[PDB]
Design a protein around this nucleic acid. Structure first.
Ligand SMILES: [Zn+2]
Lengths: 49, 497, 69, 72, 50, 288, 49, 49
DNA sequence: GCCTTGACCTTCCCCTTGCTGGAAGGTTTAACCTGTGTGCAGTCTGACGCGGCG
């Protein structure tokens, strides 16, 4: 996988929701990661590594 | 307010289990203490152990006194070893001569001889004799305490109380559990006389319906009082002073106990600093750290403070020795003692330089002759040095195979060989039964066939009878009848055996 | 279910063979359990004859020996 | 005393000295609490005699007799 | 053991104080040699065939 | 040989002692030139058995004539070396420790028993919080947990007349306190009042567990360790190959470190040093 | 030198050349994988890749 | 043919003596398991008939 | 084939001089120096349990 920054989205793992869940990721050659994402309930969330 | 930090963080610790964080969080609580903590803590330890050496005066109980140990040290006509360097030794407020000692040990023996008979004078603590005792003490107070042997002298008082105290418990073990007994009454009159049976009826004056039934064990209750009594016989004093002496040296040593703690807590960050310099991946962190802590303990245990220097460095090199020793003793399945270790270390330091300069690994001869020792020892060191290899290592590139699969038990047995031996034995005693009974049996005991043991010329003979040389010739003719190319062929196969 | 029907068994050695051994040994240990070798699996481990096929004829005999002392 | 000092004074070594000692040919120096062979001047000059006697040629036994005379 | 002990009492001959570790062809394998090689330490004597 | 059935249970210290032959004292394995066992190490032939068929350490006894003889020079018994497999050893400890399975698996089986949470018990054993053995007064309650500062608050309230502690032996005496019987009858009748969902379920689970302890003969304090067994050597070997290098079952490491810490603790215990170092060493031991 | 030699000789990439036929050689040189570090694993994989 | 020792030896020497007979034992690995669990504080054992 | 009968070999162990060398194992130095981590690990994953939290 190349470095940089990628986007994607999952098909409602809360299949209860059955709704799209977007998220986004960075990738360096070296160091630490990040992950941005939506919850089902319309809020942004973040996690390192 | 560092315990308050523990309060909150523990209130929401994220289920931590690492003791590293725990220990560092704990030691970070108590902060450093510098440039006067050293001295004032040393002076508190001074106060404690010099309260002790004040307590060390006036032992009618421990009559075995440095006078007596001074008779000991010169008992075998001489000593200049360090037993005297712990003795009296006035510091300015070094093997001692006989002249100097006999001079120093004369006035304290003078106080000894004058101070005892005056204790009789109308009271054990009579003011005149008691100030004579005070002279004995205060004369001893400019002089210093004396070495580890004095622990015995303290223990020689502990063993008193170890008995005395215990005997009261022992008397209580016969007294207070079985029947009812008061305790607001018992202690007061137990303090009252303590010497004769006088408070007995004084306590029964309440008429105590339980007390009159003092039977069927009382020949042990009073014989347990009799153990206390024969101790009063042994010692010679009804103690109230030497108990106070026990209190004095108890607080005097406890002073030190409390004291050098905060010297321990003062200097732990020093320990982790040293250790994590030494944490080159030999063993592990925490055991090294704990070893640094015993390090620091014995560093403080014998610290001169009037050298003016900072505690840190003295302690530091003692710590270095502790850990660099223990890393050597441990960290291997194979104990390699120390001198081989340091040889290896030296050697590798050398070979680094050699491969700077030669652009190559070195040759054993070269760095050996530089290291001034012959090739054999080098070669053996190299044969010895490498570690074991972890049975469960995956010789398989993937998890298809471990190394523990591809070895064999090259020790145990082999079935064909068992059958070989069995058939051989059958053939052998089949051959035996063809020959005479006495001869074959004599050979069985000669060679241990069909029995546990083995016997020889004279044993087997004199079991049968005395003969020696014709016995030899008898087994010879046994071979002659046995060589016999009709019987070999059942055993000719076993010539390959 | 299948897997827990297998686990929740009157013995445990078959149970302690394919899934989550740890829990099984723990629960069995406290109670003072004991198996009596009625299945196949357990009789295979030890190496005895199975109570089946050619071997039913012998294990029935040992059962009446449990009856007959 | 310390032991190497005495042996470098007199030229011997602790090993040879301890051989002589086990032969019972000099005063036994006491030890210390640590275990150092407590030498003296008597031990020093007795050792010097026991050295120079075999140099002269008086053997182990005979040099020991010279020593026990040195005490006498 | 007493048995082979007795056998060597008959015949007498022994092993020496050295044993064999000789290399051999494995079972079932056969073929033809075309090469040999020797690698030997420095400083050690190179023997005749070396 | 032949038998009928199997039985399983915990092992009491007396029995594990019975099983063993001789205690272990230090982590030594072998000498770097005389590849042979030491005394009171991990391969001591005195405990485990000879190296070969009827051969002692030095070779004093051989050839079946000295059958049940022990080589007093070293103290090694003469038999086959087949008992490399069988003779397991043992160990005494300084302070006890907890069997990880009997707390840390899903359901703990012990905090369960006591109704106690998990993290409370962890916070005990990692020496972060005292806890009450017994409230000698009517003020305090059993299983009541204290921080050290509030422990001191109650201390200078009372001092003597309560029972609290921090560590594992606390739990030893704790569960040694309780009784199965009357608590069982309690929960039996207590079921009758409200047989609602969680009440019924938890009461069910506990009463069953308790009764299992009751009739099985087992005992709860046996669920922690003042003792250990030492597995025999050939199950954990230490063996060359042809090149001369010894292979080593990593398990050996797991054992050897343990011993040293234990006896290291007995150094500090022979000094009555500050309890801080004591605490972290206990932590290390439990973790090991 | 340690890291370099253990890489060139103990990784899961340093494979013995296959001298069956020249085709084996050159196609083994003209390989691509997606395993190893910074990479994949069969249990971490599915079908889309 | 795997584990029992007495049996393998005895039957080798039986069948070489023209006897097709069996004499089993009980394997080693079972006892190994027993020792391994007795390492853990377990009083496993065996009940007589 | 029973007794020796004397004389002969071989091997092992121990013992005498005057030390020497080497292994294995112990205890103290005063300029000083105070809070890891350190490269992981790339998040498989669906059911089923269970604990807090409503
Ligand atoms: Zn022996």
């Amino acid at each position: 996988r190349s470095p940089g920054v990628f986007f994607d989205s999952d098909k409602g793992k809360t299949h209860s929701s059955g709704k799209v869940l977007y998220n986004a990721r960075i990738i360096p050659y070296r160091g630490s990661w990040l992950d941005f994402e939506f919850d089902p309930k319309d809020n942004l969330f973040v996690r390192i590594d | 307010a560092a315990a308050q930090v523990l309060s909150s963080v523990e209130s929401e610790i994220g289920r931590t289990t690492d003791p590293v964080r725990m220990y560092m969080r704990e030691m970070g609580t108590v902060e450093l203490l510098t440039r006067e903590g050293e001295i004032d803590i040393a002076k508190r330890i001074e106060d404690g152990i010099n309260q002790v050496q004040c307590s060390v005066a006036e032992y009618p109980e421990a009559i075995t006194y440095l006078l007596e140990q001074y008779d000991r040290v010169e008992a075998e006509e001489a000593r200049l070893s360090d037993l005297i360097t712990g003795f009296v030794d006035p510091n300015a407020e070094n093997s001692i001569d006989p002249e100097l000692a006999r001079e120093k040990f004369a006035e304290l023996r003078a106080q000894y001889v004058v101070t005892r008979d005056t204790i009789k004078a109308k009271g054990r603590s009579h003011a005149t004799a008691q100030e004579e005792i005070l002279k004995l003490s205060e004369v001893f107070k400019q002089f210093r305490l004396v070495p580890k042997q004095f622990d015995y002298l303290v223990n020689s008082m502990r063993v008193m109380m170890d008995r005395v105290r215990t005997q009261e418990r022992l008397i209580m073990k016969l007294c207070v559990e079985q029947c009812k007994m008061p305790k607001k009454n018992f202690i007061t009159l137990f303090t009252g006389n303590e010497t004769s049976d006088t408070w007995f009826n004084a306590a029964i004056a309440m008429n105590k319906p339980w007390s009159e039934k003092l039977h069927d064990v009382s020949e042990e209750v009073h014989r347990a009082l009799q153990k206390l009594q024969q101790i009063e016989e042994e010692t010679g004093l009804t103690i109230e002073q030497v108990k106070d002496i026990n209190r004095r040296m108890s607080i005097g040593e406890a002073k030190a106990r409390r004291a050098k703690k905060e010297m321990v807590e003062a200097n732990l960050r020093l320990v982790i600093s040293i250790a994590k310099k030494y944490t080159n991946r030999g063993l592990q962190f925490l055991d090294l750290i704990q070893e640094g802590n015993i390090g620091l303990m014995k560093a403080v245990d014998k610290f001169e403070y009037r050298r003016g220097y900072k505690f840190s460095t003295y302690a530091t090199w003692w710590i270095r020795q502790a850990i660099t020793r223990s890393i050597a003793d441990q960290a291997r399945t194979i104990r390699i003692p120390v001198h081989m270790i340091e040889t290896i270390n030296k050697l590798n330091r050398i070979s680094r330089q050699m491969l700077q300069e030669m652009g190559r690994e070195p040759t054993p001869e070269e760095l050996a002759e530089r290291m001034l020792m012959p090739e054999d020892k080098i070669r053996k060191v190299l044969k010895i040095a490498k570690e074991p290899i972890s049975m469960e290592t995956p010789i398989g590139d993937d998890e298809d195979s471990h190394l523990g699969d591809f070895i064999e038990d090259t020790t145990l047995e082999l079935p064909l060989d068992s059958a070989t031996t069995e058939s051989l034995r059958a053939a052998t005693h089949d051959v035996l039964a063809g020959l005479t009974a006495r001869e074959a049996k004599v050979l069985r005991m000669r060679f241990g066939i069909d029995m546990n043991t083995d016997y020889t010329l004279e044993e087997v003979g004199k079991q049968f009878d005395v003969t020696r040389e014709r016995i030899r010739q008898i087994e010879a003719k046994a071979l002659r009848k046995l060589r016999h190319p009709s019987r070999s062929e059942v055993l000719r196969s076993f010539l390959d055996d | 279910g299948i897997t827990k029907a297998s686990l929740a068994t009157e013995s445990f050695i078959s149970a302690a063979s394919f899934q989550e051994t740890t829990r099984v040994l723990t629960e069995a240990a406290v109670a003072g359990k004991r198996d009596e070798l009625r299945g196949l699996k357990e009789n295979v481990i030890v190496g005895r004859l199975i109570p089946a096929g050619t071997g039913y004829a012998y294990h029935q005999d040992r059962m009446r020996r449990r009856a007959a002392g | 005393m310390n032991i190497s000092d005495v042996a470098k004074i007199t030229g011997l070594t602790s090993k040879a000295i301890r051989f002589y000692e086990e032969k019972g040919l000099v005063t036994p120096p006491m030890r210390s609490e640590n275990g150092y062979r407590t030498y003296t001047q008597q031990h020093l000059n007795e050792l010097t005699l026991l050295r120079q006697a075999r140099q002269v040629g008086f053997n182990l036994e005979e040099s020991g007799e010279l020593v026990n005379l040195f005490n006498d | 053991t007493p048995e082979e002990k007795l056998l060597r009492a008959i015949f007498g001959e022994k092993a020496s104080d050295v044993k064999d570790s000789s290399l051999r062809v494995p079972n079932g394998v056969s073929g033809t040699v075309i090469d040999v090689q020797v690698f030997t330490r420095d400083g050690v004597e190179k023997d005749k065939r070396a | 040989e032949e038998f009928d059935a199997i039985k399983i249970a915990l092992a009491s210290p007396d029995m594990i002692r019975s099983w063993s032959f001789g205690e272990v004292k230090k982590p030594e394995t072998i000498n770097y030139r005389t590849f042979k066992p030491e005394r009171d190490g991990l391969f001591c032939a005195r405990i485990f058995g000879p190296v070969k068929d009827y051969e002692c350490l030095c070779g004093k006894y051989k050839r079946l004539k000295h059958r049940g003889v022990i080589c007093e020079k070293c103290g090694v018994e003469v038999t086959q070396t087949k008992v490399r497999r069988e003779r397991m050893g043992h160990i005494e400890l300084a302070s006890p420790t907890a069997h990880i399975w009997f707390l840390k698996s899903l359901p703990s089986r012990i905090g369960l028993l006591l109704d106690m949470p998990l993290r409370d018990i962890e916070r005990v054993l990692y020496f972060e919080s005292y806890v009450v053995i017994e409230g000698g007064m009517t003020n305090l309650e059993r299983q009541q947990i204290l921080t050290e500062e509030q422990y001191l608050d109650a201390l200078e309230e009372f001092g003597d007349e309560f029972d609290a502690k921090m560590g594992a032996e606390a739990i030893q005496a704790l569960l040694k306190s309780m009784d199965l019987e009357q608590e069982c009858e309690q929960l039996r009748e207590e079921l009758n009042e409200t047989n609602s969902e969680t009440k019924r379920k938890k009461l069910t689970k506990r009463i069953k567990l308790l009764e299992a302890f009751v009739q099985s003969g087992n005992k709860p304090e046996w669920m922690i360790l003042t003792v250990l067994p030492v597995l025999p050597p050939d199950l954990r070997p230490l063996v060359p190959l042809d090149g001369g290098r010894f292979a080593t079952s990593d398990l050996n490491d797991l054992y050897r470190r343990v011993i040293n810490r234990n006896n290291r603790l007995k150094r500090l215990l022979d000094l009555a040093a500050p309890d801080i170092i004591v605490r972290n060493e206990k932590r290390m031991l439990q973790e090991a | 030198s340690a890291a370099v030699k253990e890489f060139f000789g103990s990784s899961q990439l340093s494979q013995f050349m296959d001298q069956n036929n020249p085709l084996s050689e050159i196609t083994h040189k003209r390989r691509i994988s997606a395993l190893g570090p910074g990479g994949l694993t069969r249990e971490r994989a599915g079908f889309e890749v | 043919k795997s584990d029992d020792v007495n049996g393998r030896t005895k039957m080798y020497k039986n069948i070489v003596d023209g006897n097709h007979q069996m004499e089993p034992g009980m394997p080693e690995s079972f006892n190994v398991l027993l020792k391994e669990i007795r390492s853990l504080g377990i009083n496993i054992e065996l009940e007589d008939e």
